[PDB]
Design a protein around this ligand. Structure first.
Ligand SMILES: CCCCCCCCCCCCCCCCCC(=O)OC[C@H](COP(=O)([O-])OCC(O)COP(=O)([O-])OC[C@@H](COC(=O)CCCCCCCCCCCCCCCCC)OC(=O)CCCCCCCCCCCCCCCCC)OC(=O)CCCCCCCCCCCCCCCCC
Ligand SMILES: CCCCCCCCCCCCCCCCCC(=O)OC[C@H](COP(=O)(O)OCCN)OC(=O)CCCCCCCCCCCCCCCCC
Ligand SMILES: CCCCCCCCCCCCCCCCCC(=O)OC[C@H](COP(=O)(O)OCCN)OC(=O)CCCCCCCCCCCCCCCCC
Ligand SMILES: CCCCCCCCCCCCCCCCCC(=O)OC[C@H](COP(=O)(O)OCCN)OC(=O)CCCCCCCCCCCCCCCCC
Ligand SMILES: CCCCCCCCCCCCCCCCCC(=O)OC[C@H](COP(=O)(O)OCCN)OC(=O)CCCCCCCCCCCCCCCCC
Ligand SMILES: CCCCCCCCCCCCCCCCCC(=O)OC[C@H](COP(=O)(O)OCCN)OC(=O)CCCCCCCCCCCCCCCCC
Ligand SMILES: CCCCCCCCCCCCCCCCCC(=O)OC[C@H](COP(=O)(O)OCCN)OC(=O)CCCCCCCCCCCCCCCCC
Ligand SMILES: CCCCCCCCCCCCO[C@@H]1O[C@H](CO)[C@@H](O[C@H]2O[C@H](CO)[C@@H](O)[C@H](O)[C@H]2O)[C@H](O)[C@H]1O
Ligand SMILES: CCCCCCCCCCCCO[C@@H]1O[C@H](CO)[C@@H](O[C@H]2O[C@H](CO)[C@@H](O)[C@H](O)[C@H]2O)[C@H](O)[C@H]1O
Ligand SMILES: CCCCCCCCCCCCO[C@@H]1O[C@H](CO)[C@@H](O[C@H]2O[C@H](CO)[C@@H](O)[C@H](O)[C@H]2O)[C@H](O)[C@H]1O
Ligand SMILES: CCCCCCCCCCCCO[C@@H]1O[C@H](CO)[C@@H](O[C@H]2O[C@H](CO)[C@@H](O)[C@H](O)[C@H]2O)[C@H](O)[C@H]1O
Ligand SMILES: CCCCCCCCCCCCO[C@@H]1O[C@H](CO)[C@@H](O[C@H]2O[C@H](CO)[C@@H](O)[C@H](O)[C@H]2O)[C@H](O)[C@H]1O
Ligand SMILES: Nc1nc2c(ncn2[C@@H]2O[C@H](COP(=O)(O)OP(=O)(O)OP(=O)(O)O)[C@@H](O)[C@H]2O)c(=O)[nH]1
Ligand SMILES: N=C(N)NC(=N)NCCc1ccc(I)c(Cl)c1
Ligand SMILES: [Mg+2]
Lengths: 174, 98, 48, 52, 113, 51, 55, 140, 320, 347
């Protein structure tokens, strides 16, 4: 059962996506995005990317905090909608879960599944590398190389973030 | 492909449909945009990490940076939409039919 | 007739006139020496 | 590239990260390094129509 | 042939366009017309006003046009060089025919009655 | 070409500016006291707040 | 019957009327973000299901 | 669409009309549904029931035009014993135009449809015979 | 450098030239209420530029050699004809009012350009902010149709929005019976035909709409007939005003730059005064328009851009 | 907007486009689009009114959606080839997603709905950038990925764009909406010939940009945004009505003007590949574009519309607008047909 850890987390990943994609009140959509960001961090971490997983979780927690503030200011109504409160929201929510549940049920039964394209259901561990014994994290070496190999990437990203500040000041100065 | 890809591709598709099927709140659609980027981050990270493409490990980080610039840009426009109409409803943005 | 407000182009802008004429002359000389250079290089490469 | 300024100026802007068999930090190889090297060297210079 | 070069070195083995090229005269004429339109939109005497400006219109057009015509000629030379070399490399795809005369070839006659 | 579905279309403003909506963003009204540490127990300060 | 009517009707007058009708169908829109993007979803779906543009 | 189109062109002209009429009806019905989907998406129906009403109205009209063209073109070929004559599609094409005119209660639409559909259908048969390419593969 | 973004980047910023004395002042009142004299004296005492009230031929005064042009080059709108026959079938009444507003809009732009580019304040006699009182008087007396009023409001709503109101609004309150006597003394035969009800309508608009509106955003001073007779007392009041309200407090170099780019571009200023709204009073047929336009270009120094007309002595055309 | 801030934002619009055109890596191509989208939005909102706000919002939602589909294609391509080089894609699903992603960025039908609305909601100077400069980056990508593009998909988009552009412009009185539908119609010609000869896509792109820049510059010179407002131009500046006439006839593709050149070279390439029906259909459908160009020439130059009395005040002031390059652009828009063989410079 533990050998299917990435699969289980990925099932919750989709459930969180169905959560905010059915579009209840953005308060609950933000909750669904936090769960997905949390388990998404768990998925990436299990492939050897501890830094990538924790970083995406950290970023999305900060982003959803702002979204929460903006929601109480600009996206609220008297009766915020939960998934059960609205017929369109419930229909999308149920449809997402049933599509998800049937993909899971059949991929587990046959150890394979055709959902448009063919996916193998042997368990995700089978593709992993078999021989590691370096004294470093390969993900950390690759990310740290941004400052030696990625000079060009550093410039365009740094410039875009500076322009981003300039732009949001322009956009919101009525 | 491996079974993890089934659910990550599914998550991207769910958010894409969520983006294309609007309701009223513009904030709800901006969330679906952020979700789409999250699935792309995870989907790209798995490929890069599993293939040991060392230098590509920075690519998902760069993806998040421009995700925030998009989210910040989206929220900026939401502020102006809200100021004009007092709601973030997308049915108010229909002046340009004529 | 005699303008109540002095026209912006009432008198020639001699700095621009000099630049404009100097640029036309410069470009013309550059074009001619290039063409002569190309003609000689062309004859050299083709054994003429 | 639509405009190959990188080649004209001999500056490397992004092609260092285009392939997984390019030079990596601390010479960490990708899992498919040999396979992609063999494919790249087979198809070098003959064009996609022939390489296909 | 050279990557992202306006005029590769090999283009110098071709003769440059003459400065009396009919195509270049037309380009110079377009510059003259541009100068006239510039006076007209700004409500200046069309023919007389700003002869320094009108001269620069003619000169800039001729300058740019000369290089465009040189690259134009170069690209057509390259096309033929490529085309003829390919024919030489593949004789069996461009075989010389046996040319029959009209006294041997049978063509059907269609009367106009 | 006039049609029934566009009978309600008006030409846009001459200078692109549509008039500002008369929508009222209501201030939040708050009972500050009487039962409040800073209200001295008997002050019902009715406050309108924007944020 | 011919020059002022039928030769006009079966060509210039019929063609120009059809174009006027099509112009109205194309341009009579609500300017609603919701409807335009809902049509993007339809375009993408028929692209894969009917025309197999993804193969 | 490629699968249904192939089926129509794989049973010879004038033979097995019922099979032909299924192919043209299948093509017509799909075209009607595509029209309904954009129409419902871009011009919202007032009620769910009406949106269904609009869908059935378009899908039936489209399918009728397909069936009548497939029926007429095959039956005319078999009767006339001229399987590979573009004229058969002209008869089928015009008949479709009449069905469209009838469904619209407009003679003028029926007249124009019988013509333009008549020519277009006859043009398709010539294209099949002579190999005219609409989306021609790049070659040179 | 001609003013533009480049000049602004290099230091041509309005905050450098503006002082406590850079003020826009408008003197308003009824007909024959002593505006001109008071406005001229305020300007001379304070060191400001005086703009005489914009008339039919104001635009002529700022272009060409500054002389009035023949009346066909203003539509033949006549103030005298308005007084004689305020219900003329040819729409002279509204055509005049539309022309006068545009002249005032241009004068306001010129005034703002002077204030921003030199820092010297100006004094105006009436303005685009107060021109509507004459339109209300015309409509209440039946001299113009309601359609003309609707047109006037359309033009105003897309033009007045672009400018800042005057710092100080001086108003001379002369009651109508005294005004009628003043007109009778002035001696213009056409002006004697003004009805008192029309004059009362001018006063009702001024007191009813103009001053209540200006109070919210400008310093307003109201002087009776006699108080106005000493401009020195008026100047004393202006010199001690607080200047604590209105939009001028909110301006900065970034906004005054954008404002200056507009007012210096006169065609941009006048853009919406000719909106394609076809009122009979202001619509001109193509044949009439073409003929008059051709005659206009045959005037001395009017065929070409200023400085390119050799018929009036411009030189170095071939180098300009 | 501070003048320095305006220049920095404009140079960032260009930098993002340049990055796309010089990048050999799909990630940097995506970054270029994102940087370009970030910078252009403040240009749309420059005047701050509800229509500018609506326009920018609709633009942001469309471009942001396209970028996600663009990045999806890149990642799918990475799974199935393990590289990032900008070239043909190695998965048909990736090719479709990228092709649709670029179609939405260009505003091709049936992803076209935003183009008329966004163009109408922003000033003329911003509209000029949107309908000209913003086409460069997506086209430069199509120019490199076309060997793997699905022919039926790309020709379907081209056909629909020409039809919808032609029909859409018939019902418009607003100049910005007329230019928008014209742009959609012209986009179809560029992509229709892309599978056969990418060099002809560049030619059409360049000539379309010159003609479109000329028209927008002339509309800006007179501050005209509607058909009736433009009909007063004969009374202000007669010369500008003749330039509009010549330019509009050129955009209609009439010989011997320059705008005929791209339609002519595209028909040649298509016929060389035994494509006869499609170019014929395209040329006839382009007559719809000529129709609503001809209406503008009628109301602008070939007749004299009623004027207003206040128009006389404008006679006394000169044109102050910069009108940068308009004398050059109009000549290029009209008098270039004799130099058609110069298209080999683009080879
Ligand atoms: C892999 C699988 C794919 C991955 C996704 C799996 C699903 C997971 C969830 C994904 C998120 C879904 C988001 C749903 C959403 O936000 O829609 C809100 C959207 C608008 O929200 P709203 O503001 O609450 O409007 C309420 C009323 O619907 C509006 O009131 P009204 O007065 O306007 O009522 C008139 C109504 C009348 O409806 C009709 O006319 C229907 C006629 C159809 C003929 C049969 O108009 C319409 O509905 C026309 C649009 C119908 C859809 C287009 C059909 C063509 O509501 C809907 O359209 C209902 C759809 C909900 C179910 C979604 C089903 C998910 C599957 C989608 C297709 C997947 C393809 C792959
Ligand atoms: C060897 C030369 C052969 C000539 C070939 C002509 C081909 C067309 C060239 C188009 C460019 C023309 C110049 C741009 C127009 C500027 C002229 C203008 O606006 O008005 C005429 C003007 C005289 O009026 P004015 O404004 O008062 O200026 C005083 C100066 N005397 O200025 C003038 O005095 C006259 C200036 C020329 C007037 C051109 C009139 C329009 C021609 C366009 C028709 C199409 C051309 C023929 C098509 C076949 C092309 C061969
Ligand atoms: C494809 C085959 C056909 C070939 C097509 C070739 C097209 C490309 C050729 C260039 C086209 C543009 C040429 C414009 C020529 C007119 C320039 C001129 O006369 O300017 C007069 C003057 C400014 O001149 P000035 O800046 O002082 O000269 C120094 C330049 N470094 O002041 C003025 O009054 C100028 C105002 C009118 C010009 C319009 C505004 C543009 C500003 C341009 C600034 C000067 C550019 C110098 C051009 C040099 C080009 C080699
Ligand atoms: C009304 C006009 C509708 C045209 C008919 C649509 C149709 O039936 O297209 C079917 C087409 C399948 O044809 P296909 O075999 O893929 O073409 C390859 C050529 N050897 O399907 C396609 O793939 C072409 C795209 C059809 C889009 C039609 C709009
Ligand atoms: C990539 C592959 C895509 C192929 C199919 C794409 C077709 C594009 C459809 C969207 C663009 C056309 C928009 C349009 O024309 O208007 C929508 C139209 C509304 O009009 P409608 O309801 O049909 O008629 C009402 C009668 N008074 O609604 C419609 O019915 C349009 C149907 C067109 C279908 C083609
Ligand atoms: C060269 C080989 C390739 C061939 C391609 C074709 C080349 C031609 C390209 C033309 C380029 C556009 C420039 C045309 C120059 C036109 C000059 C002109 O019209 O005269 C100017 C005059 C403007 O008036 P204004 O400046 O005030 O002078 C005093 C009169 N008021 O104008 C007017 O006052 C006229 C106002 C009335 C409007 C009459 C409109 C009908 C005449 C239009 C003729 C031009 C048509 C050009 C179209 C292409 C022709 C082939
Ligand atoms: C080859 C084609 C060359 C096309 C050149 C286009 C020149 C157009 C000049 C427009 C006229 C000058 C002008 O009025 O400026 C307009 C605009 C600046 O904006 P503006 O409203 O004037 O003032 C800003 C203050 N807020 O000016 C701009 O913002 C410039 C926008 C145009 C840049 C894109 C040009 C088209 C793409 C060229 C790529 C060619 C390959
Ligand atoms: C908030 C709701 C959250 C919903 C979360 C949904 C999670 C998805 C359920 C995934 C369940 C995976 O189920 C997993 O399947 C494999 C099938 O080989 C089982 O593995 C099996 O392998 C061998 C086969 O030789 C058997 O002998 C063994 O008995 C059995 O364990 C695991 O015992 C089971 O744990
Ligand atoms: C012969 C094979 C090729 C033929 C190609 C011909 C294409 C069509 C060319 C003409 C297009 C004209 O387009 C338009 O036509 C209609 C009538 O036809 C005219 O309109 C005129 O007739 C219609 C109907 O008869 C009236 O409703 C209208 O009041 C009247 O003004 C328009 O003024 C014209 O702008
Ligand atoms: C062989 C292919 C030939 C292709 C030729 C090129 C086609 C160009 C088509 C232009 C179509 C637009 O032309 C348009 O036609 C309709 C005719 O119904 C005209 O409409 C006119 O007639 C209709 C009804 O008869 C009236 O309702 C309308 O009041 C009247 O104006 C429009 O005024 C005209 O603008
Ligand atoms: C060999 C294969 C042959 C395939 C044939 C395909 C034919 C093409 C069919 C396209 C879809 C049908 O097209 C659609 O039909 C309905 C008929 O009601 C028309 O509908 C029109 O007529 C009727 C009555 O007025 C109503 O449905 C509707 O109110 C009206 O708009 C639509 O205006 C038209 O767009
Ligand atoms: C409003 C007018 C719109 C434009 C009208 C233009 C009409 C042009 C006619 C369409 C082109 C001809 O139509 C198309 O020709 C090709 C041949 O290349 C046929 O191709 C067919 O050939 C073989 C038989 O040899 C079939 O078994 C096979 O199913 C199919 O490949 C298509 O079945 C036909 O659909
Ligand atoms: N119909 C109309 N007449 C106007 C308008 N502005 C001025 N006038 C007239 O122009 C003439 C001069 O205006 P006034 O300044 O008020 O009269 P005055 O004799 O100069 O008296 P003073 O205030 O001292 O200057 C008067 O006959 C006004 O009626 C206007 O906007 N509409
Ligand atoms: N059709 C393409 N996709 N490419 C293309 N232009 N092929 C044609 C080959 C060609 C034509 C002219 C020249 I000059 C050159 Cl050098 C080469
Ligand atoms: Mg006076």
């Amino acid at each position: 059962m533990m050998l299917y850890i990435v699969f289980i987390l990925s099932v919750i990943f989709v459930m969180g996506f169905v959560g905010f994609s059915s579009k209840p009140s953005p308060i609950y959509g933000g909750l669904g995005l936090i769960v997905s960001g949390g388990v998404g961090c768990g998925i990436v971490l299990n492939f050897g990317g501890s830094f990538l997983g924790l970083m995406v979780f950290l970023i999305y927690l900060g982003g959803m905090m702002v979204v929460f503030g903006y929601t109480t200011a600009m996206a609220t109504e008297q009766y915020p909608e939960i998934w059960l409160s609205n017929k369109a929201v419930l229909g999308a929510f149920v449809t997402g879960l049933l599509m998800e549940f049937f993909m899971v049920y059949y991929v587990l039964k046959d150890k394979e599944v055709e959902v448009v394209f063919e996916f193998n259901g042997l368990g995700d561990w089978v593709i992993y590398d078999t021989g590691d014994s370096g004294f470093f994290s390969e993900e950390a070496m690759g990310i740290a190389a941004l400052y030696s190999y990625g000079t060009w990437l550093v410039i365009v990203t740094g410039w875009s973030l500076l322009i981003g500040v300039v732009v949001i000041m322009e956009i919101t100065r009525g | 492909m491996s079974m993890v890809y089934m659910n990550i591709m599914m998550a991207f598709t769910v958010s894409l449909v969520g983006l294309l099927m609007y309701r009223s709140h513009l904030m709800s659609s901006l969330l679906c945009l952020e979700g789409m980027m999250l699935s792309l981050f995870v989907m790209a990270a798995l490929t890069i990490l599993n293939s040991h493409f060392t230098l590509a490990s920075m690519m998902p980080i760069i993806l998040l940076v421009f995700a925030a610039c998009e989210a910040a840009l989206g929220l900026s426009l939401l502020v102006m939409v809200s100021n004009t109409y007092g709601t973030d409803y997308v049915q108010n943005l229909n002046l340009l039919q004529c | 007739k005699f303008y109540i407000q002095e026209p912006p182009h009432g008198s020639p802008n001699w700095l621009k006139v000099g630049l404009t004429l100097g640029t036309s002359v410069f470009l013309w000389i550059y074009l001619i020496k290039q063409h002569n250079e190309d003609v000689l290089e062309y004859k050299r490469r083709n054994g003429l | 590239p639509f405009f190959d300024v990188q080649k004209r100026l001999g500056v490397d802007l992004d092609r260092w990260m285009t392939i997984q068999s390019a030079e990596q930090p601390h010479k960490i190889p990708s899992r498919c390094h040999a396979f992609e090297k063999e494919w790249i060297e087979c198809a070098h210079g003959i064009g996609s129509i022939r390489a296909e | 042939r050279a990557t992202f070069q306006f005029l590769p070195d090999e283009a110098r083995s071709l003769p440059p366009p003459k400065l009396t090229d009919p195509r270049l005269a037309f380009v110079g004429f377009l510059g003259y017309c541009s100068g006239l339109i510039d006076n007209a939109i700004r409500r200046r005497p069309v023919l007389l006003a700003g002869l320094h400006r009108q001269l620069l219109y003619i000169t800039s057009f001729v300058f740019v046009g000369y290089y465009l015509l040189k690259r134009q000629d170069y690209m057509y030379a390259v096309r033929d060089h490529d085309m003829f070399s390919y024919i030489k490399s593949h004789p069996e795809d461009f075989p010389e025919k046996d040319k029959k005369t009209y006294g041997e070839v049978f063509e059907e006659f269609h009367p106009v009655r | 070409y006039p049609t029934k579905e566009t009978a309600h279309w008006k030409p846009p403003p001459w200078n692109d500016v549509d008039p500002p909506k008369d929508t009222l963003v209501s201030n939040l009204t708050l009972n500050f006291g009487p039962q409040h540490p800073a209200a001295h127990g008997v002050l019902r300060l009715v406050m309108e707040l924007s944020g | 019957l011919l020059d002022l009517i039928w030769l006009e009707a079966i060509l210039p007058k019929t063609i120009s009327l059809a174009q006027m009708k099509a112009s109205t169908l194309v341009t009579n829109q609500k300017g609603l973000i919701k409807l335009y993007f809902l049509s993007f979803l339809i375009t993408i779906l028929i692209s894969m299901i009917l025309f197999n543009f993804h193969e | 669409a490629k699968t249904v189109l192939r089926q129509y062109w794989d049973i010879p002209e004038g033979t097995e009309c019922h099979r032909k009429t299924y192919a043209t009806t299948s093509i017509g019905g799909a075209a009607g549904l595509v029209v309904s989907a954009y129409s419902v998406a871009l011009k919202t129906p007032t009620s769910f029931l009406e949106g269904v009403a609009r869908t059935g109205r378009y899908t039936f009209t489209a399918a009728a035009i397909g069936a009548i063209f497939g029926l007429t073109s095959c039956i005319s070929a078999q009767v006339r014993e001229k399987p590979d004559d573009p004229l058969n599609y002209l008869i089928g094409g015009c008949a479709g135009g009449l069905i469209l005119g009838a469904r619209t209660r407009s003679y003028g639409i029926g007249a124009a449809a019988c013509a333009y559909m008549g020519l277009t259908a006859a043009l398709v048969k010539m294209g099949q015979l002579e190999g005219w390419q609409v989306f021609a593969e790049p070659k040179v | 450098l001609q003013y533009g973004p480049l000049a602004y980047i290099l230091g041509e910023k309005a905050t450098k030239k503006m002082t406590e004395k850079s003020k826009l002042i408008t003197v308003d009142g009824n007909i024959c209420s002593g505006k001109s004299k008071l406005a001229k004296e305020i300007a001379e005492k304070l060191g400001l530029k005086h703009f005489p009230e914009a008339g039919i031929h104001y635009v002529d005064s700022t272009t060409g050699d500054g002389k009035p042009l023949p009346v066909q080059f203003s539509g033949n709108c006549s103030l005298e004809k308005f007084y004689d026959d305020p219900k003329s079938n040819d729409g002279n009444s509204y055509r005049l009012q539309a022309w006068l507003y545009a002249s005032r809009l241009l004068q306001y732009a010129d005034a703002l350009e002077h204030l921003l580019s030199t820092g010297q304040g100006v004094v105006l006699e009436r303005s685009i902010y107060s021109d509507f009182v004459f339109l209300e008087a015309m409509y209440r007396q039946g001299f113009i149709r309601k359609q003309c009023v609707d047109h006037y409001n359309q033009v105003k709503k897309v033009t007045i929005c672009e400018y800042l109101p005057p710092h100080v609004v001086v108003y001379v309150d002369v009651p109508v019976p005294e005004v009628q006597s003043r007109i009778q003394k002035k001696g213009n035969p056409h002006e004697m035909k003004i009805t008192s009800a029309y004059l009362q309508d001018i006063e009702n608009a001024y007191k009813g709409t103009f001053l209540p509106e200006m109070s919210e955003k400008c310093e307003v001073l109201q002087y009776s007939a006699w108080e106005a007779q000493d401009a020195e007392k008026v100047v004393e009041d202006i010199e001690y005003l607080k200047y604590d309200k209105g939009p001028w407090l909110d301006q900065n170099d970034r906004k005054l730059h954008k404002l200056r780019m507009l007012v210096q571009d006169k065609l941009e200023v006048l853009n919406y005064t000719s909106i394609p709204v076809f009122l009979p009073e202001v619509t001109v047929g193509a044949h009439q328009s073409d003929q008059v336009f051709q005659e206009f270009t045959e005037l001395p120094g009017r065929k070409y851009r200023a400085g390119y007309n050799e018929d009036v002595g411009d030189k170095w055309i071939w180098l300009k | 907007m501070n003048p320095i801030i305006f220049i920095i934002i404009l140079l960032t619009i260009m930098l993002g486009t340049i990055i796309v055109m010089i990048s050999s890596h799909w990630l940097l191509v995506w970054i270029g689009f994102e940087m370009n989208m970030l910078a252009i939005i403040p240009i749309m909102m420059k005047n701050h009114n509800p229509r500018a706000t609506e326009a920018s919002t609709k633009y942001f939602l469309t471009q942001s959606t396209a970028s996600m589909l663009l990045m999806m294609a890149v990642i799918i391509n990475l799974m199935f080839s393990g590289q990032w080089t900008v070239m043909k894609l190695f998965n048909p699903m990736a090719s479709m997603l990228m092709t649709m992603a670029l179609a939405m960025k260009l505003g091709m039908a049936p992803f076209h709905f935003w183009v008329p609305e966004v163009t109408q909601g922003i000033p003329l100077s911003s509209g000029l950038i949107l309908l000209t400069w913003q086409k460069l980056a997506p086209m430069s990508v199509l120019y490199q990925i076309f060997p793997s593009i699905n022919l039926n998909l790309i020709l379907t988009l081209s056909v629909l764009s020409i039809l919808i552009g032609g029909w859409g412009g018939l019902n418009q009185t607003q100049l910005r909406k007329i230019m928008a539908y014209s742009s959609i119609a012209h986009m179809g010609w560029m992509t229709a010939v892309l599978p056969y000869n990418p060099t002809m896509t560049l030619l059409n792109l360049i000539i379309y940009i010159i003609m479109t820049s000329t028209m927008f510059t002339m509309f800006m010179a007179n501050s005209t945004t509607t058909t009736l407002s433009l009909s007063h131009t004969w009374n202000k500046t007669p010369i500008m009505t003749v330039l509009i006439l010549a330019t509009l006839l050129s955009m209609g593709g009439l010989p011997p003007l320059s705008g005929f050149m791209p339609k002519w070279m595209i028909i040649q390439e298509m016929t060389k590949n035994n494509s006869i029906i499609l170019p014929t259909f395209m040329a006839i459908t382009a007559l719809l574009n000529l129709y609503f160009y001809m209406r503008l020439t009628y109301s602008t130059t070939l007749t004299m519309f009623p004027s207003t009395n206040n128009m006389k005040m404008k006679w006394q002031f000169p044109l102050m607008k910069k009108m940068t390059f308009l004398p050059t652009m109009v000549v290029l828009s009209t008098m270039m047909l004799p130099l058609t063989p110069m298209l080999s410079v683009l080879e």
